[PDB]
Design a binder for this molecule. Structure first.
Ligand SMILES: [Cu+2]
Ligand SMILES: [Cu+2]
Ligand SMILES: [Cu+2]
Ligand SMILES: [Cu+2]
Ligand SMILES: [Cu+2]
Ligand SMILES: [Cu+2]
Ligand code: NA
Ligand code: NA
Lengths: 439, 439
């Protein structure tokens, strides 16, 4: 096929995307080896759903797993009665998700399981796929003429032809795998045909971070998790935490082969050592560098000019409340807390008013990085670690290094009960999740 | 008492040192705490025996321990029928060691248990003491006028008022303790009354190395394990491996306080870590620096001149055989080998001829330092690691770093069966010992 593997795309037809997926154990060829993964739609990653604003999505999920499951429409500002984090689909049963794509929306989103206590093994085993909301902005020449690709970054570890099981240390750190894949392929080659590439990036890993850098090139950030920036932002590298998305333009500068790498990054994962007294926890330190793909530039590349503007960011009403949410850890117990409590699905932690704006101050008092995710209500990151954010865009995951405070501007949209949690999904499964009720 | 603690001295009287020692569990005050140690003569260290050449030593060892024991007269070139490594003294029984001190002998020696499989816990618990052979060379003015002190370097760890037990890792590495003591005292102060000090140094530790350095001063080496050098040798530091002895002159250069330190040294001890895959062995790295004692110099110190000569080293006959003895390790089993075999007291490994000279090439093919010790027959170290030795003196322990070959000139003296072994005594207990028969 193409030298660059990408998930099959399913497009809405006449304003309707109607599709039956099955979550199923699936024999696959993966990275040169045969393995049985848990997949949506028979593939790893699952199919990319491509829709436009105001489309109707009608997705029937058939559960062919031996355990219950559900879907989280990660990043979509839809009703928590559709994107229902408490729903359980029993083995053999089906459930239809039906919603309308919001009118003021664009970007790369994704879908994956969200059944508390079972997310990490199900996501690690292969249950994920992308959703793209196309925009009228995609027609401006500087983007229309770019070569577009989706990059699903997800790692894996195999044992006996199946996803490796979680160890106790995996529940503490979040599980990372040795197979560092792009769209399920090991170090694919992207042979560019145009000098400007538009790359949609998705970190669908349980816990691995991707400190992205393209050899000899900057990246031009044009979209964050849930929407466009106001104008492109030049960066030398781009850290993508679990659950985050971005879209970048790449302007190929000369002929040649350029590595896209995940550079060394220390997220605070911990090991154990015994040096006499002991045993006690010790930092794992930075990740080893990984090559994600090989990028081959065309002959005599002449990249397009960058767009001068993208989409203006909405002016938000003045906020009506400030919240403080402190993250802490008990690493040796693999227990994780928000304001000193673990998740309880019966307990409402925050009560807010629809169509008001809130300021959320999320403080990481742990030693690990924690990527904080809020369902249903995209937010504007004002600052992290006391540094102002260099752009305005909708996000739904924000990474906090040890000790850092993020200040978020959170407009409350749809009414109902939803959740916020760490998107190191092992930590969510082990308690680092709370309940927000909007009325 | 004196600001500088030293073991009580027992001197020969009229050419006879006749003494009854008991090896006994003993309540002591040690480093500010009460503890029960295993001691000779009720003290830790045991009493220093001080003799002259041709003295008769008659030492009755009474075993009041709950397990068998014996004595090794470490470094003395006497008969292996007296210095008997295979003898067992049962609990409650006594044995008299009787020997004549050789005529051509001088230096610092020591005594400790040597019952195979039980040495490490008995030595660690406190069973050791020094023996000094006085020399007519001690009357030359440059030594007679020096202030003489014995420094027994031995570390300890206490648990519940008793020596800490050996762990599996202790059997692999050799046990080191957190209490780093001199003559059983924690960081004593030596208030010098003379500007020249003569320090007898003994490493009586199971496994700890002492990379000795005196702040702002060199050391003048005048004797190795088993005798004087030919002339003093200036050194900036002096590594003392387990079982080694040295004598140094210190020439105090000005008033003040000077630390005698055990500087960081990496002997190849190993720990265990678990960082995801794992678990696997990892180097412990260098030891942490320790202060051994505080040295206070007198006012306006005017040190004596160094002696120009000490004792000429004997011219040895040409050697008649070359031996090769390869040291290897199985760290995870805590098994240690010489030429691929573990100790067997029934098996003779080398057979040599009395009054001939042999060349022994001892090769460390392990990753840890191993201090190689030969009973009964002191040797001349020719080279280690391919570097010629910078002095001629009798030694009976030679340290080998990983990969190093030591070339030794070994005159065979007394007839009989004796042993050679690593003086990390845990390694001896775990097999790194062989049998030499001299006829
Ligand atoms: Cu998600
Ligand atoms: Cu969630
Ligand atoms: Cu977390
Ligand atoms: Cu010894
Ligand atoms: Cu021995
Ligand atoms: Cu050894
Ligand atoms: Na299927
Ligand atoms: Na006693």
């Amino acid at each position: 096929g193409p030298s660059f593997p990408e998930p099959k795309v399913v497009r809405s037809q006449g304003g309707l995307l109607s599709l039956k997926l099955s979550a199923t154990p699936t024999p696959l060829a993966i990275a040169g080896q045969r393995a049985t993964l848990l997949t949506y739609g028979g593939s790893f990653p699952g199919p990319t759903l491509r829709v436009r604003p105001r489309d109707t999505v009608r997705l029937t999920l058939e559960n062919r797993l031996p355990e219950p499951t559900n879907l989280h429409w990660h990043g979509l500002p839809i009703s928590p009665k559709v994107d229902d984090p408490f729903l359980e689909i029993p083995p053999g049963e089906s459930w239809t998700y039906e919603f309308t794509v919001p009118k003021e929306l664009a970007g790369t989103f994704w879908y994956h399981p969200h059944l508390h206590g079972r997310v990490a093994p199900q996501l690690f085993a292969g249950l994920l796929g992308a959703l793209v909301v196309e925009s009228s902005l995609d027609a401006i020449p500087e983007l229309r003429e770019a070569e577009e690709h989706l990059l699903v970054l997800k790692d894996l570890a195999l044992q006996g032809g199946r996803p490796a099981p979680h160890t106790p240390m995996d529940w503490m750190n979040g599980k990372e795998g040795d197979l560092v894949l792009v769209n399920g392929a090991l170090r694919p080659t992207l042979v560019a045909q145009k000098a400007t590439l538009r790359l949609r990036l998705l970190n669908a890993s349980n816990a691995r971070y991707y400190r992205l850098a393209l050899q000899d090139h900057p990246l031009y950030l044009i979209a964050a998790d849930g929407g466009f920036l106001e104008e492109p932002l030049e960066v030398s590298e781009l850290l993508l935490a679990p659950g985050e998305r971005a879209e970048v333009l790449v302007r190929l500068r000369k002929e040649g082969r350029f590595l896209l790498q995940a550079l060394p990054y220390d997220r605070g994962a911990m090991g154990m050592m015994d040096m006499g007294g002991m045993a006690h926890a010790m930092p794992q330190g930075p990740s080893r560098p990984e090559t994600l793909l090989y990028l081959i530039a065309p002959k005599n590349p002449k990249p397009l000019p960058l767009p001068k503007a993208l989409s203006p960011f909405p002016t938000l009403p003045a906020p009506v409340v400030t919240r403080r949410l402190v993250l802490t850890e008990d690493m040796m117990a693999a227990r994780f807390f928000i304001n000193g409590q673990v998740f309880d699905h019966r307990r409402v932690d925050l009560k807010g008013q629809a169509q008001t704006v809130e300021v959320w101050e999320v403080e990481n008092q742990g030693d690990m990085d924690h990527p904080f995710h809020l369902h249903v209500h995209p937010f504007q990151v004002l600052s992290v670690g006391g540094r102002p954010f260099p752009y305005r865009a909708w996000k739904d995951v924000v990474n906090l290094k040890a000790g850092e405070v993020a200040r978020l501007l959170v407009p409350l949209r749809e009414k109902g009960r939803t959740v916020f949690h760490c998107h190191i999904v092992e930590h969510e499964d082990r308690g680092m999740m709370g309940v927000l009720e909007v009325g």
